Amino acid sequence: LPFPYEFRELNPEEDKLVKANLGAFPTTYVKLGPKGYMVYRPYLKDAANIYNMPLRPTDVFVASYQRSGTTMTQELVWLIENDLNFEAAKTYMSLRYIYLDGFMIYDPEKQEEYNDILPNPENLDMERYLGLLEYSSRPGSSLLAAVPPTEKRFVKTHLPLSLMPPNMLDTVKMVYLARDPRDVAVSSFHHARLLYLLNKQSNFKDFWEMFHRGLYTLTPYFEHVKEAWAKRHDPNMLFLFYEDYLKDLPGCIARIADFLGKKLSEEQIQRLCEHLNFEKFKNNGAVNMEDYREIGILADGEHFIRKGKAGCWRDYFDEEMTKQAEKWIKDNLKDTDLRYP
Template sequence: MEEPSILPFPYQFKEISDEEKSIIKRVYNAPIASECVRVGPKGYIVYKPYINDAENIYNMPLRPTDVFVASYQRSGTTWTQELVWLLVNDLDYSTAAAIPLTARYQFLEIFMYFGEEGQDSYLNSSINMANVDMNKLFEIMKLWSTPATQLLANAPSPRFVKTHLPLTLLSPKILETAKVVYVARDPRDVVVSCYHHARLLTVTAYSGTFKEFWNLFHKSLFTLTPYFEHVKEAWDKRHNPNLLFLFYEELSKDLPTVIHRVADFLGKQLDDDQMAKLCDHLSFKNFKNNISVNYEDLREFGLMDENETFVRKGKVGGWRDYFDEDMTQQADQWINDNLQDTDLRFPSTNLIE
């Protein structure tokens, strides 16, 4: 059998400037946070370990049964993952409860957070590790630092993959072969959720204010920004039969309708009883308390700040509690500028008429 040809990774990597690095260092306690580079003409921010597996991700052998859940981070990814997995697996709630979501999906680029720099950042932090099972911790670190492309090579089908990488950094054949569910969210709510997530994860140890985080984000100095380029890549492919584009706001406002759309996309049908049970399972109250999806097991290793949670409030429009008047005006201008060249519109953002 002829071996598939390996495509050279088509994009260049560029170091961020010393000034940009100093801005990041001022608000992060972990060295890994500033050990990043820009990739490709759009300048997506990635941590340096990503470079080592970029070509393998780009050339990842795909199967027709593969299902990707893709998004810019904190856009409703976990919610969508659980929905997709249950539909593909014929509503197998018992297995979903028994096996954490992290084990049901491979997180394609998690290795870039837990390479040598990330592990050093965590192990040299001020976290009290007196009660941590170090053997188990090192097993987890080893697993997470292993490129997912290696783990996926021998994984049984169907394979479920989570990624926050933009489409251009994935295989150019992905929409010819696999199914991709992409979910997007109002960027202002994304910023708020990313801020809390950056505080949550001790591996990066964000210590700045929300306003400082906002400046990082909208100036494209946070992981995998620029945000709008990420979303627009998927939006431009929304008519491809192998990509389903969802909005977080739609999930929040009309979950049954979105479930029907996802079910149709995956070739599944639900009766009224199945729909009612799935809606109840995915209701935010139940989802937040679902230990299979909320990552609470990571607390025993000190990987999560005690004052933050992985699944937070799920609120649409919660950004208003964080943005002052100047930031609101900045955000309005930022959104308007970035929507000028596209018909992309967010359900909760009506700035351009």
């Protein structure tokens, strides 16, 4: 099948704002498709393959706009399918799942320019850093197609449905997570700091201006969410809210199990709840990506697992931003049944 989408460079306005947040970063963006989803330029080379990637009936996807609960979900989804074999779940998350669109943030043609954004390049564990770059060159598709049939595939992605095989849900199951845009904005701001993506200069307002305006990775934020929303009625789609994980974890697990075709006992659902305790998770080496810190590519004072709180966007928004945020979220939920807890 051919890729039904074209792309356009950013116009002056758009580009001006973006460079005000990610100027220092080597990878540039491009608007893909009619909705103009923001994708790192490299994505283009594999775009068509992903659109046509061969799916398998046993494939399980954990999708979401980034920073909405992907990690928590992957861990639960993995345990449930592998009969709560906590022992075997101790291997790195990035090894148990395939991050479909995780490659695009790296542009090989710019290797040199990358370490320059690191406070200290002379202190990198080169044997590892370089290996990271290599893996990060392998297109998403290739990594999926490499897994033999006798191995269940666990895919992770922040790609909207429109960029993946349409009708895919006829073959694979997916769990899409969503979270309050505002809290997502915040978490993303810090995550971008974690990997040295933002000009050490700019602040959060700048980031937010870029975010709700559809100029950040994989946004427009609402089109992304709405796409999965419209498919929640499907038997292979499970739409969840990050807020509910905090409100009723025991009940969220139940739903997932029921969804993935399992039956956990009060004990299993409970046994999983303790395993997902924030502090216990935040310190879990298999899922906190802290191994990366050894490499030398994580910012001091940042962590892949931060607070795990809800509604703390209020500590970052000023009255001005707050109004503009309300109007924005208000305007995208008009004439749609999409509602956040």
